């Protein structure tokens, strides 16, 4: 016999039933759409169409991402959207030579970075690509607000972002307690990214953490039947009092 719905859709229809239904819509819409991550290891060709060199004919051409592995320790730092390339290689690059398994590993560095909005120095493992992206986006906090989830690739990056996004939507006074000058000054330049509060606490969440959170907002000790029966009784007694 057959499953009525394809198994590929069993993950999706898992999210249409049960507690996942009661999750905030903006969050589910942030998980739904998977935007193609910025090319990192493979280098993309710009054109859609390319003239075949051998053939002399106009050829349709597509860009296929190269699978990259992210060890879990990459989720503790920020590696700049990159990771391990697991693959094979020919020796000497002659197609006729041996074919050999090969893995290319990113070069990692211990670097401490300063977050303005979070007023803190974090000791983080980053790549040279991360530093170039921070450089290019002109600030640490900039790089973290200005980059999509798929491009950071870190749970830690997403938690940093959740944090300073909250600090922006709240206008948290505890940022710089003594100097409202510094405070307004900093909260000023980042005014482009400011989002409401209901959105800001759901940004960097894994589906697990989300389901937990929603389970805790929904936590209620079932109401004693004495209450409900008392209210039914007061309803009936007030309708017996108002009819005469």
């Amino acid at each position: 016999p057959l499953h009525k719905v394809p198994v590929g859709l069993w993950k999706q229809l898992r999210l249409w039933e049960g507690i996942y239904s009661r999750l905030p819509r903006h969050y589910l819409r942030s998980l739904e759409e998977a935007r193609t991550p910025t090319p990192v290891h493979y280098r993309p060709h710009g054109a859609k169409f390319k003239i075949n060199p051998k053939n002399w004919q106009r050829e349709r051409v597509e860009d296929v991402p190269i699978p990259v592995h992210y060890p879990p320790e990459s989720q503790l730092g920020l590696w700049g959207g990159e990771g391990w390339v697991l693959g094979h290689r020919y020796v000497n690059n002659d197609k006729l030579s041996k074919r050999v398994r090969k893995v290319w590993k990113p070069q990692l560095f211990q670097r401490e970075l300063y977050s303005e909005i979070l007023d803190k120095r974090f000791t983080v493992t980053v790549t040279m690509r991360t530093l170039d992206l921070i450089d290019q986006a002109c600030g640490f906090d900039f790089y973290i607000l200005k980059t999509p989830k798929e491009d950071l690739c870190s749970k830690f990056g997403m938690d940093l972002k959740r944090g300073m996004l909250l600090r922006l939507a709240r206008q948290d006074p505890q940022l710089h307690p003594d100097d409202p000058a510094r405070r307004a000054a900093i909260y000023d330049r980042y005014k482009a990214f400011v989002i409401p509060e209901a959105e800001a606490e759901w940004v960097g969440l894994t589906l697990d953490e989300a389901v937990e959170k929603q389970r805790l907002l929904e936590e209620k000790d079932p109401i004693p039947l004495f209450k409900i029966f008392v209210e039914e009784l007061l309803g009936q007694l007030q309708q017996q009092a108002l009819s005469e």
């Binding site: 290891h41 597509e62 002109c138």
Partner: protein
């Protein structure tokens, strides 16, 4: 960062279908190592006067080692960004005044 390219051409799937991959599409040739490129420079705007490099309110080009690990942590410089640039446009206009 290693930049890598496929030895075997991948067929097309054009409608938005995901490409159908074989094991032979896992064989890569190494086209570049970014770390081995001749390295670029970093452009900054100094907020104080550095010994060798220059004055407060100056536009300087250094090597990224010196800029990342000395100047920017110590608040001796800021990035070349436009919003940070207009500040020193104004500073240059109100300096030469008095």
């Amino acid at each position: 960062t290693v930049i890598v390219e496929r030895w075997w051409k991948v067929p097309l799937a054009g409608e938005g279908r995901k490409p159908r991959l074989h094991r032979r599409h896992r064989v890569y040739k190494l086209v570049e190592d970014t770390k081995h490129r001749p390295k670029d420079n970093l452009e900054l705007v100094l907020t104080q006067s550095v010994e060798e490099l220059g004055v407060r309110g100056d536009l300087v080009s250094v090597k990224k080692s010196v800029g990342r690990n000395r100047l920017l942590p110590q608040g001796l410089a800021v990035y070349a960004s436009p919003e940070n640039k207009k500040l020193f446009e104004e500073e240059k206009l109100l300096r030469q005044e008095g």
